């Protein structure tokens, strides 16, 4: 998750 946001 850490590298991508949450609502893309």
């Given amino acids: ?3 991508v946001d ?3």
Wanted: charged share 35%.
């Fill in 1 to 3: 998750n850490e590298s």
């Fill in 6 to 8: 949450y609502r893309a």
